[PDB]
Amino acid sequence: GTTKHSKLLILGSGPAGYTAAVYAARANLQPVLITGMEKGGQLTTTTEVENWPGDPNDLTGPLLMERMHEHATKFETEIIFDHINKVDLQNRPFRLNGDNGEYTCDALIIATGASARYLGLPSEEAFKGRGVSACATSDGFFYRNQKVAVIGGGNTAVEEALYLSNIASEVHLIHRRDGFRAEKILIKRLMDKVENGNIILHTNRTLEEVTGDQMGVTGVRLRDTQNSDNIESLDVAGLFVAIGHSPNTAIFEGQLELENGYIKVQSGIHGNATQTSIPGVFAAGDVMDHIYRQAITSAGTGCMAALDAERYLDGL
Template sequence: MKPVRHIPLIILGSGPAGYTAAVYAARANLSPVVITGIQPGGQLTTTTEVDNWPGDVEGVQGPELMERMQKHAERFNTEVIFDHIGSTDLSKRPFTLHGDAGSYTCDALIIATGASAKYLGLPSEEAFMGKGVSACATCDGFFYRNQKVAVIGGGNTAVEEALYLANIAAEVIVVHRRDEFRSEKILRDRLLEKAKNGNVTLVLNHTLEEVLGDNSGVTGIRVRDVQSGQTQDIPLMGVFIAIGHTPNTDIFKGQLEMENGYLQIRTGTRGNATATSIEGVFAAGDVADHIYRQAITSAGFGCMAALDAERFLDAQKPKGH
């Protein structure tokens, strides 16, 4: 039997949401423990340059920012455990978490497990990750000012990324495997307008076959016509894979209220905004946000979750203490 350890407040996840929650919780003397998960540092560790973190005037490398956040949390005596939680029982308090290295119980839980960008799974896509292949136009679009880029996908994510990039890049090639977009009508109409009168080119009924490149990074893409099977090469500098995100919530299925896999939180103006459907369980960052998905918004959510957890734990104390 693995040992079971009780901790008043556990934070699951080690991205900006998790570490910001840890800083605030630790400063409130809650002695939080962060369980890192399978990808310590979260999505930011796959981003080379973070140019939109306020105060970092020269920009900062994603892994460096996460290292600094971890040190900040540890400075206030947050314990960081490198473990991956495989199952949970949130039906009664204390909540129970089962990890690879051991089991844990806690009185309050902050879920900051994030979301993972979906990729196509091409070897060439992986080879040029961070060297011209990205899954976040808001993060990396700036590096392609006045250059030619491609967006792969046909849903809301792809159309939003293409519209965003159209204001930065010289030309945006949108590659979609079907003949029409699955996005909301208003977004689709804006994209079609840009295709007609702007700098967007639509390559429909095509799939991405291969990302082309050399030592300097991406130099183009090879696309395949789904009907004829013919391929063509398109020279360009950046490829944005925009086929959606998957929230990391499998271990909470059937326990917490979700929408499309994202945790439902209360939000609103009365405080307790990060509360989930179970009292004492809070959510922060991309795991509960499929709209904004920025490092800074995740950090803000983490702060709110820590304050909500602090109030909750305070209310559990016997009166007169």
């Protein structure tokens, strides 16, 4: 095998890795970006995007990422289609092992994302991007004043249904258990909206099928209870699947501090905000943000990581 050294290596071709490459290339750092298997990242799995600021109309997730890729290659970012399976961050240079060879580098920006899980139903698959979504912040406004269902049982599902209750005429929260696995303040607010409002609870139910037409989702079929096969059909215009994300950090376990799988960064207002627990390794995007999880915040921390990486490489 091959070993290729780069002063700066970026892992990930989602908005954080591409923004980090355009800021690193205009800093004359000659970055190398490794795409991973999902070229373009999570935004290639959605259709219309209407919260990328400055793109009021006609943007989809694939066109934004095409534009980003064009932008990084205008500045001569070396793009490599590989995926990293093993890392050693405790010696210098850092060493990273991909399928197509070994990579070493003096500074590393990790922008590997935190992908949304789905139920795995073929009718859900059918409607992805036409009524089924895994991001309420992104897509909730398409359903303003319409009925919506959210499925899931942890923090993300209660957060998403809570967010959606301000936009949707009603929110149908679906879960298999007879309870939610969520933070206190989240459940208090949930019980408030259930009782004085907007959110309808459907505990002890599993989603059997998503129905719809040529245009999109029109319903969801549920089944069960504590002992029975009840079956409920809901009229709903959109389904938000909110069962959790998988931060792509298994390769970093035991090398970097993680907090529930997310990379912990130094953050703060005094600079070096994207530095991880190892000097010279920076993280950006959803891998280090389990709170906002948007393309624009990923591009902003991708910028910060490139400039933090430049200041580190220059001895500051």
